[PDB]
Amino acid sequence: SPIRDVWSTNLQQEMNLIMSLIERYPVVSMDTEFPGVVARPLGVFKSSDDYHYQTLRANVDSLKIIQIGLALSDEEGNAPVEACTWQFNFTFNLQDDMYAPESIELLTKSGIDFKKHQEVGIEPADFAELLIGSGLVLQEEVTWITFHSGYDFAYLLKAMTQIPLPAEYEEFYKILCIYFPKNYDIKYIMKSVLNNSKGLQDIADDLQIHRIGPQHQAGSDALLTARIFFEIRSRYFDGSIDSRMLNQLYGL
Ligand SMILES: [Mn+2]
Ligand SMILES: [Zn+2]
């Protein structure tokens, strides 16, 4: 089982496992699945970067996370034999929660069992308490990697701080850099630096990287993100990512 699935019933067991591994496998790749974008901000803003943040803020605050994928690697890009990736499945209620009906349809066709999420879905507050104590955050020794990172980190921040996201991007960025002092945004790298526009899967296809698991599920996407990072690091950066790219978020 290259993919370890996590529900409320084995949350502690799985976080313990990740904790025992993080020192030997200090690169964390993450992806998230949430109920889509439901609405856009109306009015006028300070900028396009500001427009993007307000869009993120409104949506992250209102819509509940459905999955988070975490894939661990060592610095050479090797995964632990224990697991290629973890898939954390969170509590969600189709009768009671806000979502775009289209996103739900896509996730269902993607394999998600919304019944199980309602029954044994993880509470984000429980996950966040363990994540905070895990050694994965607040530690400059750990590298976080994400494709399109505003949404991913925002959902973690939301779970960890248990308060609304900062009104302004500058403060959001400050907090983000506290909990995730060392991070790379693959979207920023691919598009803003290397001028390549393609999406996760497209990029994946060119690099002939084989997907493990279903598309649109966080565990699989997190693994794919890891493999894309290390291949790009190797092909275009000769072994080491440029430090000027650290903590640079795409579109913000
Ligand atoms: Mn993503
Ligand atoms: Zn995803």
Curated annotation (Swiss-Prot):
Keyword Metal-binding belongs to the record: yes
Cofactor binding comment, as recorded: Binds 1 Mn(2+) ion per subunit. Binds 1 Zn(2+) ion per subunit. At lower physiological Zn(2+) concentrations, Mg(2+) replaces Zn(2+). The nature of the bound ion affects the speed of the RNA degradation reaction and, to a limited extent, base selectivity.
Entry keywords, A to Z: Activator, Cytoplasm, Exonuclease, Hydrolase, Magnesium, Manganese, Metal-binding, Nuclease, Nucleus, Phosphoprotein, Repressor, RNA-binding, Transcription, Transcription regulation, Zinc
GO BP terms, alphabetized: nuclear-transcribed mRNA catabolic process, deadenylation-dependent decay; nuclear-transcribed mRNA poly(A) tail shortening; regulatory ncRNA-mediated gene silencing
Places the protein is found: Cytoplasm; Nucleus
GO cellular component, one term: CCR4-NOT complex
Function according to Swiss-Prot or TrEMBL: Acts as the catalytic component of the CCR4-NOT core complex, which in the nucleus seems to be a general transcription factor, and in the cytoplasm the major mRNA deadenylase involved in mRNA turnover. In vivo and in vitro, caf1 has 3'-exoribonuclease activity with a preference for poly(A) RNAs.
Protein name per the record: Poly(A) ribonuclease pop2
Gene name per UniProt: caf1
